[PDB]
Amino acid sequence: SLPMLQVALDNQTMDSAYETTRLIAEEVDIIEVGTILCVGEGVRAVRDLKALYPHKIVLADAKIADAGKILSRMCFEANADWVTVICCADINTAKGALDVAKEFNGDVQIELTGYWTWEQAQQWRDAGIGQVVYHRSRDAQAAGVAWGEADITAIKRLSDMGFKVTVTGGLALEDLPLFKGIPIHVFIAGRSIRDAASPVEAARQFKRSIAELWG
Amino acid sequence: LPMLQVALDNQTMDSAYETTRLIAEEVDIIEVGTILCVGEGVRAVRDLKALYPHKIVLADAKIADAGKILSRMCFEANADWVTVICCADINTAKGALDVAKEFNGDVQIELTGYWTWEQAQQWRDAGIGQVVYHRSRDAQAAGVAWGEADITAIKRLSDMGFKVTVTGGLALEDLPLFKGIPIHVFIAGRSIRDAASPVEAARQFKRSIAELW
Ligand SMILES: [Mg+2]
Numbered sequence: 508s509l510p511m512l513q514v515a516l517d518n519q520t521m522d523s524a525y526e527t528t529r530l531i532a533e534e535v536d537i538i539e540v541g542t543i544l545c546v547g548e549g550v551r552a553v554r555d556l557k558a559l560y561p562h563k564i565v566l567a568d569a570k571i572a573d574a575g576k577i578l579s580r581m582c583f584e585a586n587a588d589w590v591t592v593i594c595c596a597d598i599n600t601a602k603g604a605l606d607v608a609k610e611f612n613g614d615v616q617i618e619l620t621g622y623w624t625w626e627q628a629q630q631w632r633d634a635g636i637g638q639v640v641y642h643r644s645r646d647a648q649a650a651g652v653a654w655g656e657a658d659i660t661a662i663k664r665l666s667d668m669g670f671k672v673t674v675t676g677g678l679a680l681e682d683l684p685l686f687k688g689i690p691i692h693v694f695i696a697g698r699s700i701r702d703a704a705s706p707v708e709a710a711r712q713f714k715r716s717i718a719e720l721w722g
Numbered sequence: 723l724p725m726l727q728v729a730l731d732n733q734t735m736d737s738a739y740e741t742t743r744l745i746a747e748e749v750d751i752i753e754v755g756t757i758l759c760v761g762e763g764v765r766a767v768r769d770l771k772a773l774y775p776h777k778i779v780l781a782d783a784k785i786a787d788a789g790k791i792l793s794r795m796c797f798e799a800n801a802d803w804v805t806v807i808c809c810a811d812i813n814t815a816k817g818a819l820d821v822a823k824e825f826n827g828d829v830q831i832e833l834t835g836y837w838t839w840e841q842a843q844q845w846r847d848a849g850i851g852q853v854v855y856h857r858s859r860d861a862q863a864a865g866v867a868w869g870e871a872d873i874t875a876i877k878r879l880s881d882m883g884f885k886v887t888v889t890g891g892l893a894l895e896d897l898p899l900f901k902g903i904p905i906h907v908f909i910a911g912r913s914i915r916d917a918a919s920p921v922e923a924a925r926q927f928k929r930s931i932a933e934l935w
């Protein structure tokens with residue numbers, strides 16, 4: 508099943524985000540309230556986006572580090588479908604977010620933007636976490652860290668463990684072939700869509716490439 | 723003396739103000755807790771600094787990536803300090819620190835959940851001078867207590883050159899566990915906000931710190 512496309516709204520205000528969504532809401536599968544937007548506007552961003560686009564999956568990229576129940580409930584009460592929990596969070600923080608998520612028929616992803624270990628990954632699975640976001644840090648990318656062999660190995664291993672894997676971190680259209688033959692769940696594009704000359708055509712290019720590579 | 727910080731882990735500004743209107747003058751540091759950062763966004767920082775410009779305002783954003791961008795948003799909103807979560811990429815902590823210096827502020831590494839002594843050395847080499855030794859709320863709720871392993875780890879961090887903040891469901895009675903250590907800040911959230919008398923709770927903390935240090 509083709510990788511889906513997620514747009515990251517890493518905008519500081521709602522109006523900046525809407526300049527993107529008004530173009531591409533019907534060209535992507537998942538609308539993400541990026542961490543930058545969650546911090547810029549708060550959880551109203553999730554509520555307002557879901558109200559605009561109630562037929563789409565809305566993801567609140569809160570990167571919950573602690574207070575799993577309280578922070579997940581705030582996002583779900585704002586009508587989020589999915590929320591993120593950062594990989595270094597205490598295991599009880601993940602479980603607590605998942606418990607709330609289940610009350611709302613939502614889901615939790617673990618955000619792999621840190622150091623983390625294979626034992627922790629097993630803990631996530633036993634806890635009933637079914638999604639991870641394999642994430643090349645924005646700041647690592649800026650310090651010259653490219654997608655490499657080790658990333659492919661790890662993604663495959665996470666998939667083999669039974670996670671649906673999302674891939675993200677400065678993805679460009681030309682990076683998609685690196686991942687061919689792996690059952691990627693979702694590719695996230697932020698800058699490569701929002702900042703394109705034509706965000707609509709950028710999203711359509713990602714979709715065509717995906718349909719070729721995984722078709 | 724160790725400073726006293728109140729954590730505003732509220733979902734709305736008006737809820738936070740129920741606490742600050744009682745105790746803003748009784749503490750040294752007013753923290754915009756992560757919960758308030760998510761509830762209201764960075765306006766919480768701007769509003770609270772405008773109200774209490776003579777106090778240190780900490781934005782507990784627990785930055786995980788996009789260090790330069792998220793730190794700048796907090797500092798543009800007049801934060802004094804910001805937190806970066808311990809599993810962030812080292813370039814995230816450096817990014818946030820570089821921005822902090824532009825604004826004459828500072829970064830704290832939030833030690834919630836998993837981290838390593840190797841990473842602690844990395845932070846130090848990066849120029850990070852503050853950490854928050856944090857017993858996770860969810861760990862506390864699963865029965866994790868403070869213990870001697872926590873004291874040993876705090877001393878170790880202190881010896882490495884970090885100014886250490888101590889937090890995680892701290893009660894007045896917990897203060898003597900840390901005697902002898904040059905603790906930079908003690909945070910109280912629930913034990914001040916939710917006390918029968920928040921003013922007495924804050925003054926009792928300050929009194930005990932003055933006794934012990
Ligand atoms: Mg994101």
Ligand SMILES: [Mg+2]
Nearest residue numbers: 729755756782
């Ligand atoms: Mg806090």
